[PDB]
From Swiss-Prot, chain A:
Changing K98E: In VHLD; type II. Changing L137R: In ECYT2 and VHLD; type II. GO terms for cellular component: cilium; cytosol; endoplasmic reticulum; intracellular membraneless organelle; microtubule cytoskeleton; mitochondrion; nucleoplasm; nucleus. The lineage of its organism: Eukaryota, Metazoa, Chordata, Craniata, Vertebrata. This is von Hippel-Lindau disease tumor suppressor. It comes from Homo sapiens (Human). Changing R106W: In PCC and VHLD; type II; common mutation. Changing V109G: In VHLD; type I. Changing S50R: In VHLD; type I. Changing L102P: In RCC; with paraneoplastic erythrocytosis; inhibits binding to HIF1AN. The chain holds residues 62 to 202 of 213 of the full protein. The keyword Cell membrane applies. Changing S50C: In VHLD; type II.
Swiss-Prot record, chain B:
The keyword Coiled coil does not apply. Pathway: Protein modification; protein ubiquitination. It is found in: Nucleus. This is Elongin-C. Overexpressed in prostate cancer cell line PC-3 and breast cancer cell line SK-BR-3. It comes from Homo sapiens (Human). SMART domains: Skp1. Ubiquitinated by the DCX(AMBRA1) complex, leading to its degradation by the proteasome. The lineage of its organism: Eukaryota, Metazoa, Chordata, Craniata, Vertebrata. Keywords: Host-virus interaction, Nucleus, Transcription, Transcription regulation, Ubl conjugation, Ubl conjugation pathway.
Curated annotation (Swiss-Prot), chain C:
Disulfide bonds: none annotated. This is Elongin-B. Keywords: Acetylation, Host-virus interaction, Nucleus, Phosphoprotein, Transcription, Transcription regulation, Ubl conjugation pathway. It comes from Homo sapiens (Human). Residues 1-66 form the Ubiquitin-like domain.
């Protein structure tokens, strides 16, 4: 269902990473499969060639944590006016304190050891319930 | 308008009422002081800092910084966030 | 510009914000509203330094980029019990436990 429209109309975009994370751009291809693209270090930008109606989202390349692009989940390149590129401001969401806590705990404890942690069962599930693109694609649909 | 949040070790954190209502658990404990027998001061100070952070950066175009969490307090802060639903 | 502060005395900590251009005295009015003690019974501090009523929080080193929402600056507070001021005493927060083995 969620897939890029095969418009064939070029659209230039600036991917601008105003997050402190390494950014993984993900293009949803014509059959809805996520295609990973080269990464952007923190604070960097790239002028890229995409197309009108194509779908993109952005993640942390290491952890797959979700990121926002122009304040939302999905970015769809639009028509270029006066030959100016479309800006895609990639930023950190305001994570819930819980989700932030989970990120930091995931970054310190190998997935083998989550069960050794002295916490309630549902938090162990929350830790193992990694941010995952496939899961988010189902939701958005 | 303020409310008082009291840590397990007796520290009294005084924050805006609207900030503390970020937490559904705190709303329910209020509906204006709340005692937290399981949350020590080094965790509840951070919780209060998250309120300030959340309120300041929710719906804002100005670039958003990372909310910092020392490794030493992360496990306890997780448990507190799960309890407080925030 | 907003600055984000923790005003602290003994085991009391007030989270609030003020303007960089606001004065020390004005911060005491804020404390007065919350703890019910007038400015003349309050001393405010940056670390060990006593702050003068007429100075701006900015002049006294509380700037927007150091007194941040997620990491607020600390302002010490002491009260006069009747005739003379108590000494500045800020109780430290509790110590985190040892990192578990896995961490
Ligand atoms: C026919 C068509 O549209 N295709 C066939 C390609 O297999 C994928 C797609 C295509 O050309 N796309 C999909 C997206 O709309 C972007 C566009 C594309 O691949 N442009 C080339 C490109 C190369 C590198 C990068 C990136 S992303 C981060 N750094 C770089 C250099 C972005 C775009």
């Amino acid at each position: 269902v969620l897939r890029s429209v095969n418009s064939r109309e070029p659209s230039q975009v600036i991917f601008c990473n105003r997050s402190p994370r390494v950014v993984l751009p993900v293009w949803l291809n014509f059959d809805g499969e996520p295609q990973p693209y080269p990464t952007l270090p923190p604070g960097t930008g790239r002028r890229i060639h995409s197309y009108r109606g194509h779908l993109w989202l952005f993640r942390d390349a290491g952890t797959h944590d979700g990121l926002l692009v122009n304040q939302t989940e999905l970015f769809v390149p639009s028509l270029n006016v006066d030959g100016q590129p479309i800006f895609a401001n990639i930023t950190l969401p305001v994570y819930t304190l819980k989700e932030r806590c989970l990120q930091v705990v995931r970054s310190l404890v190998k997935p083998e050891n989550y069960r050794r942690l002295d916490i309630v069962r549902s938090l162990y599930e929350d830790l193992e319930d990694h941010p995952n693109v496939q899961k988010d694609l189902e939701r958005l649909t | 308008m303020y409310v008082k949040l009291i840590s397990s070790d007796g520290h009294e954190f005084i924050v805006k009422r609207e900030h503390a209502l970020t937490s559904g658990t705190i709303k329910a404990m209020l509906s204006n002081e709340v005692n937290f027998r399981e949350i020590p001061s080094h965790v509840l100070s951070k919780v209060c800092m998250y309120f300030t952070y959340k309120v300041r950066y929710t719906n804002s175009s100005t670039e958003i910084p990372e909310f910092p969490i020392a490794p030493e307090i992360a496990l306890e802060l997780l448990m507190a966030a799960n309890f407080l639903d925030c | 510009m907003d600055v984000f502060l923790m005003i602290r005395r003994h085991k009391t900590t007030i989270f609030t914000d003020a303007k960089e251009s606001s004065t020390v005295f004005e911060l005491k009015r804020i404390v007065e509203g919350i703890l019910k003690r007038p400015p003349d019974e309050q001393r405010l501090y940056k670390d060990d330094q006593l702050l003068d009523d007429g100075k701006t929080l900015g002049e006294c080193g509380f700037t927007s980029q150091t007194a941040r929402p997620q990491a607020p600056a600390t302002v010490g507070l002491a009260f006069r019990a009747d005739d003379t001021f108590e000494a500045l005493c800020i109780e430290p927060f509790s110590s985190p436990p040892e990192l578990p083995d896995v961490m």
